[PDB]
Amino acid sequence: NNINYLKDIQRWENYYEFPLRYVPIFDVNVNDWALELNSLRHYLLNRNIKFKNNLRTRLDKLIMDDDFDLADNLIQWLKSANGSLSSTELIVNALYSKINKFCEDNMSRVWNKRFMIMETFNKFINQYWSQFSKLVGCPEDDHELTTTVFNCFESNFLRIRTNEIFDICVLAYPDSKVTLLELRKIMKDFKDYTNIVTTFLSDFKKYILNPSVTTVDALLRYVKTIKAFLVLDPTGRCLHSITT
Amino acid sequence: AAESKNYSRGNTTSSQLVESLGIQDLTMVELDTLLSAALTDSESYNLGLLCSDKNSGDILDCQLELWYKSFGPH
Amino acid sequence: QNILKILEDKLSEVRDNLELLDRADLQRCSAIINSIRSDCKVPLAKNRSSKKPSDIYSILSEIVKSAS
Amino acid sequence: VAFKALEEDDFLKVKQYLLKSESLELDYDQKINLKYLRVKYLVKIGDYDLSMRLINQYVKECCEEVADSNWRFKFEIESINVLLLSDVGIRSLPKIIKLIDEYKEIGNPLRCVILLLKLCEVLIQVGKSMEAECLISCNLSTILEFPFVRKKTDELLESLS
Amino acid sequence: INDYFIDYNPLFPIFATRIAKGLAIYRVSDHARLAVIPIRNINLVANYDWDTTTGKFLSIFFKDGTIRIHDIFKDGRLVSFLRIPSTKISKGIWDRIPLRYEPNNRDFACNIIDDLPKLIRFVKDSKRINIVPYTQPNSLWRGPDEDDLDSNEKLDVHVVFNEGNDKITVFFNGDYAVFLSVDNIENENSLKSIIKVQDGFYQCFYEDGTVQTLNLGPLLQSKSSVNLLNYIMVIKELIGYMLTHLEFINRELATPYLDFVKRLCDEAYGYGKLKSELEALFLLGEISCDLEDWLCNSVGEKNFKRWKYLGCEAYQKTVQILTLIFVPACERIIIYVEKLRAILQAFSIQNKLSYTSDLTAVEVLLKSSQKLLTMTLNSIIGLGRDETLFEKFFIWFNDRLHEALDEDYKLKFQFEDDLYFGYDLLSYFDRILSKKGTEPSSIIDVKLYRDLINSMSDMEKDIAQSNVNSHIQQHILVDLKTDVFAQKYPSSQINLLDAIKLPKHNYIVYLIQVTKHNSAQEPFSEENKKKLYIGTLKDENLGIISKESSVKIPALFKSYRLSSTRFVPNRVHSLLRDIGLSDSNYHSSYIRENRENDDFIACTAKVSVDGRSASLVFPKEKQ
């Protein structure tokens, strides 16, 4: 009941195996010592919920501060334990959190660049993909994992652009025109369009439809959105919804 | 990614609730209740049979739980 | 139970006495095949579709509109 | 009258009525009530091997012969009660949770609360009454609105004390 | 625009200025008038407060006890009128707290009101009777703004302070009122300024330097307690909602129909003679000379169609309002009082507080509302029989009337269609022509309905006062008045002027007048100088941070009342540039309105608090 952190189990392991060096009892060819260690680790995983949660938080923190070696040791420890918390779920969540934060850091409010999603993906791959492949153990040339990572990057790019579409269309236009055309290449579902308009109305009505705002600037910004969305949407159905 | 698409469009689902309660392992919880007190011989062979099962799941958990009950602190 | 859990994975060929499992499709296919061999309940799955509650007048106007 | 007699522990009266049940010509709605009455009476006596073999047959034919969901639920919770009363309620955990999230979407408050009491009753017979008290305390406000579960709710409170 | 007034809207570049004709609104960028609020006397207005959460509305406080709120965006249109029972207002603050009820698995308290279809109102215009969706009386200024994507329900709390006695009154949602009695009534200290720390946390600052803290935190953190507050407000509204419609049918449907019957029958022919004559007409067909005059001259064709039109709406519209209004409302009353009972019972066990609130008040309302639903259903069945008796009467009355006016009418309807046709025809006469029928309650027992609803409404005020106020007050803690400045200044009499909170910052900036206490051993020292020390306190625990620096007043500014200074946030520097950029009658050197008006000081005190500064304005009230 006194175990709360990984460092506690490592020092207890050292505490138990301290006499092992001075008296050899475990045969080299049989990994007996490892068997009960994994057994005790498995029970601690499957009996102590607080330890399980602490391991989740510790791994998330370690992957966040780029302590890759200790994270690899943690993953090795979990795999050896073979508990009800498999390392596959943890690395998935850790990778997903890391890519989200990297996306938030990098492609926030930057719209002048063209094909920047490729630039972001390449920069992230060169910075972390080799370390991530070492953590998982899969070959560096895993094509379908890179494809899924790219698909998540563009989904994150879409989500950020949906959030910022108001400042995108009102202020930066027409300087942000290029990324609007790139955005056009991504949107494919009716839900994407209904979310893009209902957010854009919400902010525009929040900010522009104030009577405290001058009417001349309100119209000037309004037509700026009209041309921006017209270039974004050749059909103009969203323009009709906005106009109505 | 698919779950995030719905999430974009946490402890909200019941699976996390049962995970939080710490009752995920059906057999381990059941034997923990059964061993609470005793240890009648007729039952003990039945529990020992579970440890000596030809094929099962968390067999190692039951073995060490039985060891804790037999020779642990009390 | 674990032995049956194993059979929940690799069994896909319809090999009789399916009722002790918990997979309906294999049971339904077995029921379909057993009927054809005999010549028997093709129980169709009801689509459990699923939101605004609206007001009284909107409901009443809806029913009189659909009445005609 | 028989249901009232069951509550007042008039086992002689309900036993004699069940004899009439097997040889009467009854409507389906009357059939299920006496079919359901027989299950509740058998739980009171104490014999559970017969009742358990009997109740699952009822619900299985309560989903194929007639697609009656309301009578499927009332029969289902009786299977939970007989299990947990026999000091083995852990087997019911997959079944109750499947009904909890299913009825959360439906939104019937009675269905949600009655499952909470069965969930709470399970958690206190495992040795983990600590979190059961924590769960019941947060939801104590919304479970007193239902009168017929108050007696089971109040009785559980004295157990926790 | 030169004035010592004006509070800037934190969320939009708009200010509220004061002019002679009323409260005025001018855009900062254009100096263009936007709205005018007609106010009679400035002295009656205790203070005005803007909307912190949304900024679309504006609040005005009157000294007598009325709160009036106008929206800026609708050209200053009045949107709601508020009253507080017998309260003298000194200074009020309006706050909007948005609730966040994130979905949690441990919360099994599902809602079914959303599930039940929403009610509808009955409103009749001049042309016809129309039916519109139901809207709460205060929902127009509380409804989910089209602007707020975060449409989370917002708790509306109005806090009221009474002058001369320092009594604290808190007002919720515009209907429910809670009274809190302060223990420190020994000193009649005027309240200088109100500062809001976060949602539901307020600090009050009096002239003597004592600080009083009101905390809504425990109430906000208890999910059930807020629901208790919401439920008791709904129950009172719906009871009046039924009562509003009950007087509608009595005034619009019942009385006009009966008055037409009375004028056409009693004023023309009489009741007792008519009933006997009509039965003779029904059985024998004997029409006297006088009665034929009544059919031709009094009734005629013109009133007959009106009689049918008035009668049909008197019954067919009456049943609609009983089924579409009363039944859904009475079910909703029952569901809410049942939830009302459950909440109080739980906290009687959960708190385990020694004092208990009796539940007989709830039980009486439960049976009374249950009595109503049984009683309305009896009427709906009753009006069903009335329609049958109604129609059978006129289908025969059509036949007699036209025969008297045509002498060649071909009788289309036949009595042989129905066997008991006579009994229904006669039974209508007794209902419409009798001493009980003469009363306005002939159609429905309006008096019994009016008494029963008022019985619940009067009892509903009892449950709110006796029990709900007891529970809300317990969850409300009022911090005792304390002196913080004594530790830094223990030998000085402290005079407090004003203090505000700088947004996005957790520090309290205050302006104080420090006068050293002169002991009885130092006679008549000239060090009785009023020092306008300014310091900072952390918003939570009011802890001193920086050493106070005494601002040196120039000798030219000693002829002004320093006590009347107030804080002015949100870029006062913008107006200074615009004054010189606008060809107005206002000159900046000091902002002066011409050469013949009062001069007001704009002390832009650059108090560098972690690199940031505020702004002050010094009013002119010459001593």
Side-chain angles (χ1 to χ4, degrees), chain A residues 1-46 48-244, chain B residues 1-2 4 8 10-18 20-38 40-52 55-57 59-73, chain C residues 1-39 43 45 53-54 56-68, chain D residues 1-48 50-144 146-161, chain E residues 1-147 149-480 482-623:
Chain A
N1 293 330
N2 303 348
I3 308 303
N4 284 300
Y5 321 107
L6 202 56
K7 60 186 293 295
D8 314 328
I9 200 66
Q10 264 96 29
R11 63 202 60 264
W12 282 128
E13 284 179 354
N14 241 35
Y15 189 94
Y16 293 144
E17 75 187 2
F18 188 91
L20 192 147
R21 84 181 69 77
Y22 292 107
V23 53
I25 304 292
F26 285 101
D27 199 353
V28 179
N29 292 330
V30 288
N31 39 36
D32 168 34
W33 177 232
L35 196 166
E36 284 87 8
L37 256 291
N38 290 341
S39 85
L40 270 69
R41 295 163 181 174
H42 172 268
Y43 181 86
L44 181 61
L45 273 182
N46 293 132
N48 198 340
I49 43 159
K50 97 198 310 183
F51 183 74
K52 186 176 176 173
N53 301 345
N54 293 348
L55 268 194
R56 286 187 173 180
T57 57
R58 171 159 259 280
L59 181 58
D60 293 330
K61 284 181 25 163
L62 284 169
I63 203 65
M64 271 315 328
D65 76 5
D66 303 334
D67 293 1
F68 279 94
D69 184 58
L70 286 183
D72 187 74
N73 297 123
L74 151 62
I75 292 305
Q76 296 316 332
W77 192 83
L78 269 294
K79 163 163 55 33
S80 75
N82 207 13
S84 74
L85 211 30
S86 290
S87 56
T88 65
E89 287 79 3
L90 292 176
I91 55 166
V92 162
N93 235 321
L95 168 67
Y96 202 79
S97 188
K98 199 65 176 199
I99 61 185
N100 290 355
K101 177 67 45 35
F102 190 82
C103 290
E104 290 144 13
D105 286 338
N106 177 4
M107 57 170 144
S108 65
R109 216 81 42 84
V110 172
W111 315 306
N112 55 5
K113 301 311 180 299
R114 183 159 27 81
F115 311 130
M116 161 275 308
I117 53 169
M118 51 168 188
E119 300 179 353
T120 55
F121 167 75
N122 287 337
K123 194 178 173 187
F124 183 82
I125 286 294
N126 301 341
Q127 281 188 336
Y128 299 109
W129 197 241
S130 62
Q131 296 151 328
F132 267 108
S133 186
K134 183 193 54 62
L135 291 171
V136 185
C138 288
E140 185 70 24
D141 193 291
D142 207 335
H143 50 43
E144 167 209 10
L145 199 68
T146 52
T147 304
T148 52
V149 163
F150 190 80
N151 280 345
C152 178
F153 283 170
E154 58 83 13
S155 302
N156 265 287
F157 168 78
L158 164 149
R159 180 183 59 112
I160 291 172
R161 291 325 175 217
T162 69
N163 287 335
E164 300 173 342
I165 193 65
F166 175 77
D167 291 337
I168 284 168
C169 294
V170 167
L171 299 184
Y173 198 77
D175 307 334
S176 56
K177 194 282 211 183
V178 51
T179 191
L180 265 282
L181 264 281
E182 200 175 26
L183 178 51
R184 182 172 89 174
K185 307 301 150 286
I186 298 156
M187 261 285 318
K188 286 178 185 166
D189 195 78
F190 187 69
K191 142 73 167 34
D192 315 329
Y193 323 133
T194 192
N195 199 5
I196 208 67
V197 314
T198 192
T199 312
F200 184 82
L201 319 184
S202 73
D203 323 288
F204 143 75
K205 164 202 191 303
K206 176 188 172 201
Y207 296 116
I208 304 298
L209 291 187
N210 195 343
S212 79
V213 188
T214 73
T215 184
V216 47
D217 290 332
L219 241 182
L220 164 148
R221 267 80 64 87
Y222 179 84
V223 298
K224 207 44 159 161
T225 88
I226 298 299
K227 50 193 285 184
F229 268 103
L230 186 41
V231 177
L232 161 61
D233 183 27
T235 78
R237 297 183 181 94
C238 66
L239 294 172
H240 187 304
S241 304
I242 294 162
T243 296
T244 311
Chain B
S4 71
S8 67
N11 56 334
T12 311
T13 183
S14 177
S15 64
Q16 306 145 339
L17 161 73
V18 76
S20 167
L21 288 181
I23 75 165
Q24 298 105 315
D25 301 75
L26 277 299
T27 66
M28 201 275 268
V29 163
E30 176 80 338
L31 63 91
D32 183 76
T33 62
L34 163 154
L35 291 172
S36 71
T40 308
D41 176 292
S42 167
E43 286 48 40
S44 77
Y45 265 108
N46 167 38
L47 330 179
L49 180 158
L50 164 56
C51 325
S52 160
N55 42 2
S56 291
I59 38 177
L60 58 171
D61 203 341
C62 324
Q63 302 188 17
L64 162 73
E65 260 297 329
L66 268 295
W67 171 8
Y68 180 83
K69 177 58 181 68
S70 49
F71 320 122
Chain C
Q1 172 76 14
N2 171 306
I3 289 165
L4 264 304
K5 241 196 74 175
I6 294 312
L7 265 297
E8 304 296 13
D9 184 76
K10 67 182 184 294
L11 155 53
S12 161
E13 170 283 349
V14 188
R15 48 147 295 171
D16 296 329
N17 50 84
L18 274 302
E19 58 309 338
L20 319 89
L21 303 147
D22 61 356
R23 41 177 50 196
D25 54 350
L26 271 297
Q27 272 155 136
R28 184 181 61 82
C29 276
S30 178
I32 283 284
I33 293 298
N34 261 43
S35 70
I36 308 308
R37 296 201 174 195
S38 293
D39 317 303
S54 295
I56 323 289
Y57 210 107
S58 67
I59 288 183
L60 274 293
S61 51
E62 173 274 308
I63 88 163
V64 67
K65 181 216 59 179
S66 56
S68 185
Chain D
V1 158
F3 273 108
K4 285 283 305 309
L6 209 60
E7 301 277 338
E8 296 183 338
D9 308 26
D10 198 331
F11 297 93
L12 160 59
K13 210 195 279 292
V14 63
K15 186 29 196 297
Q16 298 282 15
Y17 196 106
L18 262 293
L19 261 295
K20 290 176 184 181
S21 175
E22 302 218 20
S23 205
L24 274 157
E25 303 218 89
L26 295 148
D27 170 29
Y28 173 85
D29 178 75
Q30 306 156 353
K31 272 184 179 173
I32 297 295
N33 273 0
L34 275 71
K35 191 182 285 185
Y36 171 67
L37 182 52
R38 186 191 325 255
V39 174
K40 280 225 297 189
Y41 163 72
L42 280 153
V43 171
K44 259 55 173 184
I45 303 284
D47 47 346
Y48 307 137
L50 194 144
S51 69
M52 171 55 38
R53 294 191 287 99
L54 188 62
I55 164 176
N56 82 321
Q57 158 192 321
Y58 289 163
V59 57
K60 190 200 71 70
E61 82 183 9
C62 193
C63 191
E64 298 325 281
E65 195 176 3
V66 176
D68 196 312
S69 304
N70 262 5
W71 277 125
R72 187 168 64 203
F73 170 78
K74 291 190 179 72
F75 274 145
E76 184 65 32
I77 73 159
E78 204 53 36
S79 70
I80 299 172
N81 200 294
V82 56
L83 268 166
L84 71 79
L85 197 150
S86 63
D87 273 18
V88 178
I90 281 314
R91 314 277 213 283
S92 86
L93 291 173
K95 216 73 61 193
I96 164 175
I97 288 176
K98 277 164 156 282
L99 288 184
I100 285 174
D101 65 335
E102 190 223 25
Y103 271 100
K104 288 294 288 295
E105 160 269 358
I106 296 290
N108 190 356
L110 193 38
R111 303 275 193 259
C112 288
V113 166
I114 181 51
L115 297 186
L116 177 141
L117 259 280
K118 304 311 168 64
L119 186 72
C120 216
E121 286 176 352
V122 159
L123 279 195
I124 65 134
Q125 81 157 25
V126 184
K128 320 175 83 175
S129 176
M130 186 209 37
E131 49 273 60
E133 164 284 338
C134 183
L135 190 142
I136 197 69
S137 167
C138 296
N139 303 113
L140 182 65
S141 53
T142 185
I143 66 172
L144 268 295
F146 305 148
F148 94 99
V149 310
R150 271 201 63 272
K151 163 192 172 306
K152 206 60 181 295
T153 300
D154 289 319
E155 190 268 336
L156 197 141
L157 255 298
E158 289 108 11
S159 71
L160 295 177
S161 74
Chain E
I1 319 296
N2 183 12
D3 50 348
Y4 84 116
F5 276 137
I6 279 178
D7 185 9
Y8 309 68
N9 181 5
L11 170 60
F12 302 101
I14 181 53
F15 62 83
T17 187
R18 201 168 320 200
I19 64 177
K21 66 179 72 66
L23 265 294
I25 291 93
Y26 298 77
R27 290 180 290 172
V28 171
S29 65
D30 294 344
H31 310 252
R33 162 100 58 78
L34 188 63
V36 168
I37 318 319
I39 194 71
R40 305 274 63 71
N41 326 90
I42 298 303
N43 298 318
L44 331 171
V45 152
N47 59 340
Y48 34 59
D49 187 15
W50 263 83
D51 190 345
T52 81
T53 298
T54 69
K56 196 168 76 72
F57 299 123
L58 163 153
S59 174
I60 295 172
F61 285 84
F62 290 72
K63 282 211 171 189
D64 69 334
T66 88
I67 297 174
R68 296 178 67 250
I69 45 174
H70 315 73
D71 62 355
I72 287 328
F73 289 63
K74 266 208 159 188
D75 213 39
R77 191 179 193 181
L78 163 75
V79 75
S80 181
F81 189 93
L82 277 301
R83 291 295 294 270
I84 306 174
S86 290
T87 45
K88 336 164 196 178
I89 326 301
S90 65
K91 173 171 50 216
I93 177 168
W94 179 26
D95 189 359
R96 278 191 147 205
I97 304 185
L99 281 166
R100 314 310 300 101
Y101 264 50
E102 60 92 21
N104 194 311
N105 287 120
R106 316 211 150 193
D107 283 358
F108 284 154
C110 328
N111 194 326
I112 44 187
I113 294 97
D114 45 359
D115 192 336
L116 268 65
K118 289 128 205 168
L119 313 86
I120 65 178
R121 314 185 49 86
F122 272 5
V123 288
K124 166 220 167 185
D125 72 84
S126 69
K127 326 323 183 191
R128 305 168 303 87
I129 309 177
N130 289 332
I131 307 168
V132 298
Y134 167 59
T135 57
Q136 311 189 26
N138 272 347
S139 73
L140 159 60
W141 69 278
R142 294 183 55 182
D145 322 67
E146 299 175 352
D147 282 303
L149 174 54
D150 287 334
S151 45
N152 43 6
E153 181 96 350
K154 317 164 187 174
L155 195 57
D156 294 328
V157 180
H158 280 109
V159 189
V160 182
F161 298 87
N162 301 138
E163 73 270 16
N165 50 40
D166 299 332
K167 293 169 192 173
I168 296 187
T169 279
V170 54
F171 200 51
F172 297 91
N173 304 64
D175 212 314
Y176 197 53
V178 182
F179 294 92
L180 322 177
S181 285
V182 152
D183 55 351
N184 298 336
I185 324 293
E186 283 209 356
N187 260 320
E188 303 200 19
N189 309 129
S190 60
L191 185 58
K192 281 299 183 194
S193 68
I194 306 318
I195 174 175
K196 171 187 170 182
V197 189
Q198 74 272 17
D199 301 339
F201 200 97
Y202 311 75
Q203 304 277 2
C204 329
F205 282 76
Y206 291 93
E207 56 72 40
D208 58 336
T210 59
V211 191
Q212 179 161 64
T213 310
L214 185 180
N215 188 12
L216 268 187
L219 177 149
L220 265 275
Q221 282 175 359
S222 177
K223 313 293 170 154
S224 303
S225 300
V226 179
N227 291 339
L228 182 70
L229 242 193
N230 201 349
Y231 290 168
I232 191 63
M233 195 280 317
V234 173
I235 270 176
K236 178 185 167 189
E237 204 281 331
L238 271 163
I239 288 170
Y241 168 79
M242 321 205 278
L243 181 61
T244 300
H245 275 175
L246 179 60
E247 301 316 280
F248 173 83
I249 51 176
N250 183 59
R251 195 193 39 92
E252 179 58 35
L253 295 181
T255 307
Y257 171 63
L258 299 182
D259 298 344
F260 177 85
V261 163
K262 154 161 301 193
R263 146 176 50 89
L264 189 148
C265 296
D266 197 0
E267 292 197 320
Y269 193 73
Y271 284 163
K273 188 155 37 70
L274 196 41
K275 175 185 171 191
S276 304
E277 253 270 355
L278 283 179
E279 290 186 0
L281 168 59
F282 164 60
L283 287 188
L284 310 177
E286 297 180 2
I287 294 173
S288 69
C289 44
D290 65 38
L291 186 130
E292 190 190 2
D293 156 79
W294 186 76
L295 269 303
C296 73
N297 289 315
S298 293
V299 180
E301 172 78 6
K302 43 213 171 293
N303 301 321
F304 173 74
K305 184 182 211 313
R306 150 142 304 262
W307 196 353
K308 190 164 187 167
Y309 175 71
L310 278 176
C312 94
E313 312 296 336
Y315 290 126
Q316 289 166 348
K317 295 295 178 183
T318 303
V319 59
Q320 292 173 8
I321 195 167
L322 264 298
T323 68
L324 295 184
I325 291 317
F326 272 99
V327 177
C330 154
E331 294 168 341
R332 283 161 182 273
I333 297 298
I334 285 309
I335 198 184
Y336 277 130
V337 54
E338 171 36 30
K339 280 182 173 185
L340 196 32
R341 183 193 71 182
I343 280 292
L344 293 176
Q345 283 178 341
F347 249 109
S348 69
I349 291 182
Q350 203 66 107
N351 290 122
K352 204 50 177 170
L353 199 143
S354 299
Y355 281 82
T356 75
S357 57
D358 231 334
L359 318 164
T360 54
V362 159
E363 166 78 49
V364 167
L365 163 72
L366 191 51
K367 302 311 222 73
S368 292
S369 304
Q370 279 184 341
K371 182 184 176 186
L372 178 56
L373 186 52
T374 302
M375 153 187 318
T376 166
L377 275 185
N378 289 338
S379 294
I380 308 170
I381 300 169
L383 294 323
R385 294 173 188 170
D386 258 36
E387 188 65 8
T388 72
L389 305 188
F390 175 92
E391 171 78 353
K392 287 176 191 188
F393 164 78
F394 292 105
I395 192 59
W396 164 79
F397 225 81
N398 173 84
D399 259 309
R400 290 298 98 171
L401 180 48
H402 284 86
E403 181 67 15
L405 300 191
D406 193 13
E407 77 145 58
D408 261 352
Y409 208 55
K410 188 40 183 297
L411 254 298
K412 312 154 169 305
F413 181 77
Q414 301 172 3
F415 300 163
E416 299 187 357
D417 301 333
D418 185 289
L419 94 174
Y420 300 158
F421 182 80
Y423 258 129
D424 296 349
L425 202 173
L426 153 67
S427 293
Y428 186 80
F429 290 135
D430 304 278
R431 175 178 329 281
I432 196 162
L433 321 183
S434 67
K435 321 317 159 204
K436 316 148 191 175
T438 54
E439 306 165 35
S441 64
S442 65
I443 176 142
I444 320 106
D445 194 357
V446 172
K447 176 274 159 174
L448 190 55
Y449 278 145
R450 187 182 318 171
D451 171 39
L452 181 53
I453 295 207
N454 281 17
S455 179
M456 269 163 38
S457 177
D458 294 359
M459 181 45 158
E460 175 270 333
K461 283 165 192 165
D462 193 5
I463 169 155
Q465 272 159 223
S466 48
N467 312 323
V468 185
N469 283 119
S470 157
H471 186 243
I472 290 295
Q473 280 182 15
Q474 289 164 8
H475 269 200
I476 278 280
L477 57 95
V478 165
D479 165 44
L480 293 199
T482 54
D483 189 6
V484 187
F485 292 18
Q487 293 333 288
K488 196 168 184 178
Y489 307 96
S491 304
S492 316
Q493 179 187 11
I494 180 55
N495 177 29
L496 178 56
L497 307 190
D498 75 334
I500 60 151
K501 177 169 176 160
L502 165 77
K504 307 175 174 182
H505 293 109
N506 50 358
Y507 309 122
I508 296 178
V509 52
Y510 58 86
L511 166 64
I512 52 174
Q513 171 205 301
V514 174
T515 312
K516 205 73 201 153
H517 259 290
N518 283 356
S519 64
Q521 296 183 343
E522 284 202 351
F524 295 90
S525 64
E526 282 203 332
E527 287 220 323
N528 273 348
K529 290 175 187 159
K530 283 81 176 176
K531 270 84 64 179
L532 70 166
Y533 280 104
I534 172 181
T536 46
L537 312 179
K538 53 176 180 285
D539 55 350
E540 195 42 85
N541 203 68
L542 319 89
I544 317 173
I545 302 180
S546 72
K547 181 50 202 70
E548 273 163 24
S549 300
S550 67
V551 187
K552 171 62 176 67
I553 298 169
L556 299 161
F557 298 86
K558 289 184 175 180
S559 57
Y560 285 75
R561 289 181 182 177
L562 323 177
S563 51
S564 42
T565 299
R566 81 203 47 79
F567 271 99
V568 286
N570 288 322
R571 275 195 168 189
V572 185
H573 292 284
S574 55
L575 187 77
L576 279 165
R577 208 187 216 191
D578 300 334
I579 280 166
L581 286 168
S582 55
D583 278 334
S584 68
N585 289 336
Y586 299 100
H587 296 313
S588 65
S589 65
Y590 313 95
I591 306 171
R592 297 184 181 162
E593 180 178 8
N594 278 331
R595 295 178 182 182
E596 294 189 343
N597 271 347
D598 285 305
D599 304 304
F600 304 99
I601 318 171
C603 158
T604 176
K606 190 196 179 185
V607 195
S608 181
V609 283
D610 305 342
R612 297 281 84 84
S613 61
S615 292
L616 278 301
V617 168
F618 263 65
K620 178 195 167 202
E621 285 192 10
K622 277 200 167 189
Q623 293 166 358

